[PDB]
Amino acid sequence: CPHIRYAFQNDKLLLQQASVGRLTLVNKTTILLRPMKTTTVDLGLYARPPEGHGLMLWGSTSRPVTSHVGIIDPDYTGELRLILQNQRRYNSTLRPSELKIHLAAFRYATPQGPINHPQYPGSVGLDVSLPKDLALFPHQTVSVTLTVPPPSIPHHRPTIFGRSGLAMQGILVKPCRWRRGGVDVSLTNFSDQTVFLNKYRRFCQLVYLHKHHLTSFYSPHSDAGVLGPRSLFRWASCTFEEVPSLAM
Ligand SMILES: O=c1ccn([C@H]2C[C@H](O)[C@@H](COP(=O)(O)O)O2)c(=O)[nH]1
């Protein structure tokens, strides 16, 4: 893997380390999560993955807070943000050091409804459409099955991730592998309002990760937070290169 070029400037976050292909930031100040509302951390982080790769952005905490897992497109030159939701019905705080924020690369592939190309080219994921109307009540999870197999790509593995638009509205998708038998996709509404998602609405994205990026082995090179403990995410072995001019 060629270098991941990045810029980072944010007095409220500490760069812990950029090691073995993963950059990790930690919060230096208390982050308040109001209940029933989205909390968005503006990271002051900018990054460009090498050829053939996308970037994975995720948060880790032992507190009752769930973060959106972000898929970062190769063409994205804006600021990276972490989107957080509160699991509780009262204020939850992330005290200093309680939130870790990770960025790492992965190889992906692209096949040529319900699986759709986004209208902007070299994007990592393909939009997946809802097969039925769903009503998502506050602080509840709703699941839906996708049964028809996606195209098979040699040496790659279809996965499902959420998108940031619904995440901002309080709706998170739990990332998961789309195995041959079908996938049950779970949507959780962390807001106080009922969200009605209609049949055919895009509700998640399909990403083909190179098979090397999924492992059962725990190590400083993998993380169970992303897609869960069965399918550990093992990022590409890239080097981070600071390029200050990327900061906007
Ligand atoms: O958690 C995230 C997810 C995405 N993005 C940026 C990079 C993506 O290329 C772009 C669009 O994301 P989606 O709307 O496809 O999720 O927003 C973030 O900053 N944080």
UniProtKB/Swiss-Prot annotation:
The reaction(s) catalysed by this protein are: dUTP + H2O = dUMP + diphosphate + H(+)
Q: Which SUPFAM superfamilies match?
A: dUTPase-like
Q: What is its EC number?
A: 3.6.1.23
- Per UniProt, the enzyme's principal EC class comes to hydrolase
Q: Which GO terms describe its biological process?
A: dUTP metabolic process
Name the coenzymes or cofactors required. Answer: Mg(2+)
Keyword vocabulary terms for this entry:
Disulfide bond, Hydrolase, Magnesium, Metal-binding, Nucleotide metabolism
Record-linked InterPro entries: dUTPase-like, dUTPase-like_sf, dUTPase_trimeric, HSV_DUT
Q: Name one GO molecular function term.
A: metal ion binding
Transmembrane helix is among the record's keywords? no
Q: How does it assemble?
A: Monomer.
- Report what the protein is called: Deoxyuridine 5'-triphosphate nucleotidohydrolase
